[PDB]
Amino acid sequence: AQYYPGTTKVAQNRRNFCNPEYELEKLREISDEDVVKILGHRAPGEEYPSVHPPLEEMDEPEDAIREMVEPIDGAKAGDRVRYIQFTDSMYFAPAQPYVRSRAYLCRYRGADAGTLSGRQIIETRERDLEKISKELLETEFFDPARSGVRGKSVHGHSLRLDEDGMMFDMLRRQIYNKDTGRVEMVKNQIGDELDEPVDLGEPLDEETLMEKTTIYRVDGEAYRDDVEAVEIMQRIHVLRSQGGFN
Amino acid sequence: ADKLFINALKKKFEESPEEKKTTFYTLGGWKQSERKTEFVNAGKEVAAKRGIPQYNPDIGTPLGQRVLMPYQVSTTDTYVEGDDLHFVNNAAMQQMWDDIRRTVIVGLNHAHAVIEKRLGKEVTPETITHYLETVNHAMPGAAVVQEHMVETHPALVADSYVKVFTGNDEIADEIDPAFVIDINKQFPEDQAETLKAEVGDGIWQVVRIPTIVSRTCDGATTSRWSAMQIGMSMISAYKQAAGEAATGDFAYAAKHAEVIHMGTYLPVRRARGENEPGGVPFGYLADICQSSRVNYEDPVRVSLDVVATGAMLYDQIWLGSYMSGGVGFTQYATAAYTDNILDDFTYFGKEYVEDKYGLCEAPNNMDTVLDVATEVTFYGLEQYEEYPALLEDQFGGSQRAAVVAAAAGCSTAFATGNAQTGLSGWYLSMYLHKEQHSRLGFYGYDLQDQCGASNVFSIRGDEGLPLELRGPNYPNYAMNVGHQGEYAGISQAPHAARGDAFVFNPLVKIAFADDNLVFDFTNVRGEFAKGALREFEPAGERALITPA
Amino acid sequence: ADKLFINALKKKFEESPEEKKTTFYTLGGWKQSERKTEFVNAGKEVAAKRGIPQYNPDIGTPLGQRVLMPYQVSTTDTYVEGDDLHFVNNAAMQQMWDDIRRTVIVGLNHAHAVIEKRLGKEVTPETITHYLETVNHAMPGAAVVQEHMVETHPALVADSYVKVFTGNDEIADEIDPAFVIDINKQFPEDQAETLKAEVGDGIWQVVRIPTIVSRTCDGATTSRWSAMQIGMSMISAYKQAAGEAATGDFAYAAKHAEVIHMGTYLPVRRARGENEPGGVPFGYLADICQSSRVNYEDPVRVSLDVVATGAMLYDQIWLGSYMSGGVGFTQYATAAYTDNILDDFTYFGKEYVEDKYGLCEAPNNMDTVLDVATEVTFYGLEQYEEYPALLEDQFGGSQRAAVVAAAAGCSTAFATGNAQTGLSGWYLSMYLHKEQHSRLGFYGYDLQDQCGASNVFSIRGDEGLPLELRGPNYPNYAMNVGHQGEYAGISQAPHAARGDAFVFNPLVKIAFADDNLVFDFTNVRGEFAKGALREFEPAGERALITPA
Amino acid sequence: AKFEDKVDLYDDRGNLVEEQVPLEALSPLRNPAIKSIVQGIKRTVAVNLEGIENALKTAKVGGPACKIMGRELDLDIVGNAESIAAAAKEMIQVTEDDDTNVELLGGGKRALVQVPSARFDVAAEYSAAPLVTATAFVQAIINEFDVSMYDANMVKAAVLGRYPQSVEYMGANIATMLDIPQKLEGPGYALRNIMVNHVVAATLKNTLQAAALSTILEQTAMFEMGDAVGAFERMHLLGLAYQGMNADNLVFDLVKANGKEGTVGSVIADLVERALEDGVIKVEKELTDYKVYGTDDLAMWNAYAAAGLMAATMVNQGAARAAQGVSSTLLYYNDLIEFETGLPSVDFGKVEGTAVGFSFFSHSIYGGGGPGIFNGNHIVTRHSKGFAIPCVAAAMALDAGTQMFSPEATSGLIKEVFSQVDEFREPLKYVVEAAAEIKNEI
Amino acid sequence: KTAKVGGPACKIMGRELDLDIVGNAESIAAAAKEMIQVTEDDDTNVELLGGGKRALVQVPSARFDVAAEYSAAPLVTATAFVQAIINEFDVSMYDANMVKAAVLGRYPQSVEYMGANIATMLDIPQKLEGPGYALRNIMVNHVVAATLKNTLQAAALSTILEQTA
Numbered sequence A: 001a002q003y004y005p006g007t008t009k010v011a012q013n014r015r016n017f018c019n020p021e022y023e024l025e026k027l028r029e030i031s032d033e034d035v036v037k038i039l040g041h042r043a044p045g046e047e048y049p050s051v052h053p054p055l056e057e058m059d060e061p062e063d064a065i066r067e068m069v070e071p072i073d074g075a076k077a078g079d080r081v082r083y084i085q086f087t088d089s090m091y092f093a094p095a096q097p098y099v100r101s102r103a104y105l106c107r108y109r110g111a112d113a114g115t116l117s118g119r120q121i122i123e124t125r126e127r128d129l130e131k132i133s134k135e136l137l138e139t140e141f142f143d144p145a146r147s148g149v150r151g152k153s154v155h156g157h158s159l160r161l162d163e164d165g166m167m168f169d170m171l172r173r174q175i176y177n178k179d180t181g182r183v184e185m186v187k188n189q190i191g192d193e194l195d196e197p198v199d200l201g202e203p204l205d206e207e208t209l210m211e212k213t214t215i216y217r218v219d220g221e222a223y224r225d226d227v228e229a230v231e232i233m234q235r236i237h238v239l240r241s242q243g244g245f246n
Numbered sequence B, C: 001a002d003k004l005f006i007n008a009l010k011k012k013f014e015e016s017p018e019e020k021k022t023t024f025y026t027l028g029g030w031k032q033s034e035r036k037t038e039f040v041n042a043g044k045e046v047a048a049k050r051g052i053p054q055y056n057p058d059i060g061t062p063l064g065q066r067v068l069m070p071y072q073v074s075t076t077d078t079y080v081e082g083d084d085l086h087f088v089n090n091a092a093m094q095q096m097w098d099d100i101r102r103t104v105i106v107g108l109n110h111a112h113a114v115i116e117k118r119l120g121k122e123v124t125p126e127t128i129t130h131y132l133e134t135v136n137h138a139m140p141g142a143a144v145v146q147e148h149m150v151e152t153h154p155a156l157v158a159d160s161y162v163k164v165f166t167g168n169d170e171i172a173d174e175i176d177p178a179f180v181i182d183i184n185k186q187f188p189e190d191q192a193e194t195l196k197a198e199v200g201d202g203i204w205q206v207v208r209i210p211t212i213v214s215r216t217c218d219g220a221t222t223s224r225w226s227a228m229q230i231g232m233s234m235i236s237a238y239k240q241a242a243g244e245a246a247t248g249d250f251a252y253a254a255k256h257a258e259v260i261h262m263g264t265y266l267p268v269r270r271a272r273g274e275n276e277p278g279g280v281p282f283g284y285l286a287d288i289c290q291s292s293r294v295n296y297e298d299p300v301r302v303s304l305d306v307v308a309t310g311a312m313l314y315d316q317i318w319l320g321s322y323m324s325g326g327v328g329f330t331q332y333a334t335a336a337y338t339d340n341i342l343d344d345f346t347y348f349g350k351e352y353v354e355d356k357y358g359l360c361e362a363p364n365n366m367d368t369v370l371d372v373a374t375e376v377t378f379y380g381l382e383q384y385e386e387y388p389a390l391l392e393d394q395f396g397g398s399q400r401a402a403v404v405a406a407a408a409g410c411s412t413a414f415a416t417g418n419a420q421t422g423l424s425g426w427y428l429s430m431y432l433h434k435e436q437h438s439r440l441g442f443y444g445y446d447l448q449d450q451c452g453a454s455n456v457f458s459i460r461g462d463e464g465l466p467l468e469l470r471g472p473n474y475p476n477y478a479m480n481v482g483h484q485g486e487y488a489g490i491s492q493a494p495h496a497a498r499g500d501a502f503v504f505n506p507l508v509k510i511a512f513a514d515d516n517l518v519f520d521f522t523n524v525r526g527e528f529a530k531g532a533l534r535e536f537e538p539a540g541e542r543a544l545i546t547p548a
Numbered sequence D: 001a002k003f004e005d006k007v008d009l010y011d012d013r014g015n016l017v018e019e020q021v022p023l024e025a026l027s028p029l030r031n032p033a034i035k036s037i038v039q040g041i042k043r044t045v046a047v048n049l050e051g052i053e054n055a056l057k058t059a060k061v062g063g064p065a066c067k068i069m070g071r072e073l074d075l076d077i078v079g080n081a082e083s084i085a086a087a088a089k090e091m092i093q094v095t096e097d098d099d100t101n102v103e104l105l106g107g108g109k110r111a112l113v114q115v116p117s118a119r120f121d122v123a124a125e126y127s128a129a130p131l132v133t134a135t136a137f138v139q140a141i142i143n144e145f146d147v148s149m150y151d152a153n154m155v156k157a158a159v160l161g162r163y164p165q166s167v168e169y170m171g172a173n174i175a176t177m178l179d180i181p182q183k184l185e186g187p188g189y190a191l192r193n194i195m196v197n198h199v200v201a202a203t204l205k206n207t208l209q210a211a212a213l214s215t216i217l218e219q220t221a222m223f224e225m226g227d228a229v230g231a232f233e234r235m236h237l238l239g240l241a242y243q244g245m246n247a248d249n250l251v252f253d254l255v256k257a258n259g260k261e262g263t264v265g266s267v268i269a270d271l272v273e274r275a276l277e278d279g280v281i282k283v284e285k286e287l288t289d290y291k292v293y294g295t296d297d298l299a300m301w302n303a304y305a306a307a308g309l310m311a312a313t314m315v316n317q318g319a320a321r322a323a324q325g326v327s328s329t330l331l332y333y334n335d336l337i338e339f340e341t342g343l344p345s346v347d348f349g350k351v352e353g354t355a356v357g358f359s360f361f362s363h364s365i366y367g368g369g370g371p372g373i374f375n376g377n378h379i380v381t382r383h384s385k386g387f388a389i390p391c392v393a394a395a396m397a398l399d400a401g402t403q404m405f406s407p408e409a410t411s412g413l414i415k416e417v418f419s420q421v422d423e424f425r426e427p428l429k430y431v432v433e434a435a436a437e438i439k440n441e442i
Numbered sequence E: 001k002t003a004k005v006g007g008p009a010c011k012i013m014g015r016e017l018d019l020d021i022v023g024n025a026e027s028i029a030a031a032a033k034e035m036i037q038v039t040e041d042d043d044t045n046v047e048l049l050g051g052g053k054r055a056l057v058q059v060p061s062a063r064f065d066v067a068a069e070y071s072a073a074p075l076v077t078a079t080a081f082v083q084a085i086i087n088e089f090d091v092s093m094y095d096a097n098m099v100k101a102a103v104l105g106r107y108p109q110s111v112e113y114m115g116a117n118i119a120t121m122l123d124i125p126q127k128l129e130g131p132g133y134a135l136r137n138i139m140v141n142h143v144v145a146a147t148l149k150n151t152l153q154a155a156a157l158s159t160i161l162e163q164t165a
């Protein structure tokens, strides 16, 4: 599959996030317990709550489509649908909102992805959400200074960075440690204090942000100079126009 | 010269507008704001008096971790916090909607035919003046026939009256001028000739019912109240029996055959009667705004005064209250009438078009749409990238999408002279913006936007309509902020570049050319600033009938 | 003892009320009246200020060739000219309508289930009380989640709040009483046990949105405004993601699956959304009036307080403005709530029935309708023939038809305990009255009246309905004055005689048992007098945001 | 034939039923099974005899929480159902051997009613079904128990609710899959105002049959609205065949290839490969490492892309067994495919647009709700001309129990009565059989 | 030709289109008939009147036996004439929305076909006072006009429509 037109680094990064054959660079290690704590849906050692009984207990009628489509593990279990949400700074965060929803629906099964300017969310069955979340948090989807895990109070995508290079967060869930050069998650994604903070590693320096970003800007690569990507947008517009008419 | 938004960005923030970094969390939250401080104190006072907790700044999250900004009302030098632009807190905004809701246009053409042909009596300017004197007694709620009538207090209903207009100058000049909207006085020569040509010998009433009644009741009251008192005044002024068969022809004429509502009624999911915001088509909203007859030398000023009229009415009062409510949508609309931002973008696009094509010179086709809307889109987006203070000001992607696409769609229609290609340029803008920044608006912002290109030139039942005839009830447009007032500006744009007197209904244009209105429709942004300063005096209050 | 109307007739006229002749034409027309003189003076001041003639006593026919009467508001000792009972001039009447229009009842039962099942979280009296502190900040238009929100001024919106009620005493007694409509405190013990059994363990919100918003917008705003701020307060108090799939189940529950509107929407000819007067069924109007929980030892006082509520809302505001306008229909309504006239007639009927049958113990059949409605019809008519001052007071036939038939229909339902035979007695009264005096009401008064007998017990699609479920949109009733408020009184009458806590909807009854309303629904006629005297303080005014 | 296209039709197990059927044999204007389905939907009513009896016994009539003390009537309706139903049927029918059906269910607690087709051939619309049914049952209950003139109005309130004070039958104990004509968002919309949960309940959650019934109703409305007249007709018929009728087993085969491990993106890749293999699309231009595809048949590209959209919904929401993400599939299947190809998405962007607002109004405070409460007449989901709602039906058929407003919650009365009707329950089977029957008449 | 579309007194300056529709009425009508019919020689009728100024259109009965209601008459008619007018003159994509407006008016911004240049004896389903009322929303003057003021035939047509409702 080709995913996206264009000849910039931004274009190629958009294609790499979409392509499930592209190995996302891992930047940081986070424990399973700490992914669960940052999600905030259940406590360490709490069993997965259910919203309905396990599929095996349901005894369903013959349906060829259900027979052909394998349920994800949390669907077989009857897990709640829960979420993880990220905010990406327009100052060259690596992932950005439509890049995320486009990539999630090429990479992940059984996914409800939503895009907004200031937040992007995926909702899926809880045990599977914890497996995808580890990948969203440990890889180049995430930078701990220019991206934030935020289930509410998301303001900051469009704000000026502070003097540490961190995005604004009304609830200060991610705190830059001057003594380590590292960010700690101090609250979960809804803003409740964590018993112990989670190491998120060092923010990417400016060169690596520029290498990995998927936003077009005049002070990075401008979209208007990616003339092949503009051509396909304009093509789409004109073809939908003429199709709607006759 | 500097970009037109620079002054505003220098007022809002200590840093120069190009500076990428700042420091947050040091402003004391809500305590940085005079208006939040007034609200905290008033919540304490309200909750103590009534015995139920109310406003409390410690419920939920703590506002003001970043600068709570002032906003410049565009075209003014007034800077206010945004709460002063919420429709609840701004009496000019409430009165702008009351003045539209309480107005109807009602012909006298069928009515004079009924009097000549059915009653066998003559109509002349003199009999019209006597009828006008009579209806200006009766329209506010006072009696002309029966004994023992009890009536409205004239000072509570001082804003209700009836005027007339006609395109016949000699007939206009014969009717008492107290009652006449004088087309030649209110409009420059060329527009006046266009409007008088449209009206001809037709004679129309502009009826305004009392704001206190509109507020007590609804917009569908207006044409009924108008017709009741027209009916009484036809009885009294032309010496009818007081209720005979011919009386029903004046009722059917005033209520149906020669009425022009400001808004048409809505379907059941969003049920409303006439004269509610969702029924006002975009070409009528451009006609209600009176910037066209004052600022005709500057088509950008005329178009963006219509965008301010519409962004406030359609997003703040209609979508943000009739269709939702709560804290609502103040800043989704203020992005289109503050900080001179949309002005900077749209002057750029007008100048680009002037230079490449000449206004109204460009071919009316897709090539022009692709050239102008792309060029103006990239200009606007580059401003947010060059100026971090501008991006932190218009912090929601939906606000940016509406402002960039309004400048692109208005500029396209300044090139073509045709609002449909303007509309196609608005959609292309959204598609380019989405791919540039990998974001557009809120979750639901581009429902109409992705339907948009295909429905611009469709001809199917519930898809095809010239932009001027669309409105908040066009199906794709019925839900979402950041479009409807901008579409009223695109509908105004080619007509302001052409120098046309009106966009869609010349009767509606004339009917707001009247300084007896409470709100001044020639200077909508100026009035929004006056209301934000708490200096506007609305009609409709109950002070005269309540304790001192 | 004197008939109940004698005091008022002695106040009106110099003659004793039995006297048959008078003198006319010597009172100086309008100059006899304080109120007319205030209006003439105001007219001259308004016309000069705005440059358009307005109220003028020399236009049309000269009011006051007879005495312009004062009216006693029934159950009070307040006497006022009828102009002080026009809804435009009476802020208590306007507020009564705003308090209904801006109220909605919204369950928490689906909401709490979504929290326990989809979210997997607990609900307790503690998490409800937290939710109610949150929604009492949010509901008037203040923010709980996002940064840089701009909000409503708390003092402009001090009348908006959320309370709850439940039949579960142990949850009710544990929430801050600030938020609770306490059924045990508000209702006498018999009525409280009926209401708590109807509600059971359900928990319901009574949401009142701001009067300034209801006036700016319409009734259909109310349930949307309520739902937006319940949705925000659910997200903030229960720690949802701020906008996840489960958020949509709170919106569907608060907007559709567990909402109770005050009025349902109307057909297109009279297009209106929810919470407008035509959608309010008569059973609800009786339940909104709170006389039942104060005056329960006197079924006539409870029934006639419902008639006053309904006559004013349905005839003066709804038919006389929303559906017409102008001078309107003040005295078509005041006939039912002034000079103790309907009270005299109805206390006569109540005694007749209590002596002959005992309350509620007559057979529920046509023999009882014929006996009681004919006896009470001839009593009321005889009073107009014995007291020439009473006839000159209720001078319009429609006024007399409504008053005599309301007493006949209420007394019939006091006998049978059933509103439907009450309604049949109303129609029989009209047919007897028409034959006795060779007139009834105005040209179109008895459209419903002649359809009436046949449609009382029909079962067909658009004909058949218990009276309690009928309202101003029942087809026969959709046009005419002098019926709808009286039908609300008939709907109340058998329930008041039976001692029932409510007529049609227990939730509606409880929802107005609240002294944090601006209007006092326990004493509707007392409030109408207070408004007439200019002593009622309404909500909604803009004085705080306008100049001195 | 006006069009030369032929399609192969299959059953809901992926087996061929009939090869080379002309496209118009599936037209709502020609196919006699779609005519039967549509006339069935206009004429069928579910009567809740138990609910009428309970509303009378408690006097709880006229809508939620309403009750009239002192008006209680205790009538043994369910124990006399057979007699009540027979007396209702003799008023409902036109003649004794016509197509009127009145059938008790649940031990007489419910009745299936199908009002005779002939009443509709001399009616303007479809409200005769509830209004003829309601009066015949109100009159049959009054006559069974000799209810007096003084009390009969309570039977009418228990059956039809607060109408005509309310515009709708508010509090009624009858139900139809259609809703009242005043609620149409435009003229021609009545076959669109059918809750998605009602279609899923009538088809017993069989995914392919729910998607077929939803497509049949949506594309039949497109004819009534005039959208499928003239230039657009073939586009609508091909959408019907390929998205709703599994033409050429395209949907089925995509689901089979992507069901064990697939995503929306894997389905896209397969559909673009299939469209190229079949000559529907071709490379028009090479950019830098990027092929721009073109087509000489936009209606067929749109149809193939529609089949892929359905399959993607089945893969995506089938893997979650949770319907909510259908709004996301309907958005990003179409957003991804246009950047994958350079061709327009399904319905030229209007599915993608419907999905943006549907996503917002199923994850926000402002309105909407869960997937199952939408319908083609809903303001949020009316914009695509038949190509979005059938996917919502498939998704709710695949939901394992994540919804509060599930078909069990909203549509139990409808499920008991309307799933009894073979053509409503298994329409894929009857429409394909009828198409094979009329194949030589096109 | 005047750009007077969308309801009383409405006009869009600059949108005028001068098309010889009445002079080409036969070709336009035939092209609309071909879209309106289901099959050749079915009960579709398209007949010109008043030297091409008017057309009587009867949409085929079969489209109603697969419809919920009656709006297919105006909607199928209107779109077949809009497409036949566009095709007759090769109206461009840019201008064709004015043809749509001149035929069907301000719909869908208005609920009714406000300013349409087509007419039916029935009115839209939203305007019914109750379900089942559509055959009642037929103006008395329409009945009297269709029966040429023959007293008994106007009484008969009105009673048929009333009692059928």
Ligand code: F43
Binding pocket: A116, A117, A118, A119, A151, A152, A153, A154, A155, A156, A157, A158, B325, B326, B327, B328, B329, B330, B331, B332, B333, B395, B396, B397, B398, B399, B440, B441, B442, B443, C138, C142, C143, C144, C145, C146, C147, C149, C150, C228, C229, C232, C235, C242, C243, D363, D364, D365, D366
């Ligand atoms: C709870 C929701 C989901 C929902 O259905 N509506 C919300 C909230 C609602 C509330 C917020 C009031 C409060 O704080 O109590 C109100 C004011 C509507 C109301 N009920 O009165 C609103 N949004 Ni929202 N909403 C807005 C916006 C936005 C932007 C904010 C992005 C940012 O980076 O700050 C994003 C959508 C996007 O990402 O594009 C957004 C989301 C959201 N919006 C998220 C909460 C976001 C968060 O957790 O912080 N709004 C805007 O983009 C600007 C205008 C602003 C509206 C108020 C005004 O117009 O003045 C407000 C309009």
Ligand SMILES: C[C@@H](OP(=O)(O)O)[C@H](NC(=O)/C=C/CCCCSSCCS(=O)(=O)O)C(=O)O
Binding pocket: B269, B270, B319, B320, B323, B324, B329, B442, B443, B478, B479, B480, B481, C224, C255, D361, D364, D366, D367, D368, D369, D379, D380
């Ligand atoms: C959709 C429908 O609601 P329903 O599904 O409950 O009928 C309809 N409501 C609406 O259309 C709501 C429109 C106004 C509110 C939404 C405007 S978009 S601006 C908010 C975006 S964000 O700040 O939350 O991200 C109604 O009739 O009430």
Ligand SMILES: [Mg+2]
Binding pocket: A029, A030, A031, A032
């Ligand atoms: Mg590890």
Ligand SMILES: [Mg+2]
Binding pocket: none
């Ligand atoms: Mg350049």
Ligand SMILES: [Mg+2]
Binding pocket: B515, B520
């Ligand atoms: Mg002025």
Ligand SMILES: [Mg+2]
Binding pocket: C515, C520
């Ligand atoms: Mg009090």
Ligand SMILES: [Mg+2]
Binding pocket: C518, C520
């Ligand atoms: Mg008081």
Ligand SMILES: [Mg+2]
Binding pocket: D286, D289
């Ligand atoms: Mg190659």
Ligand SMILES: [Zn+2]
Binding pocket: B214, B215, B216, B217, B218, C214, C215, C216, C217, C218
């Ligand atoms: Zn109002």
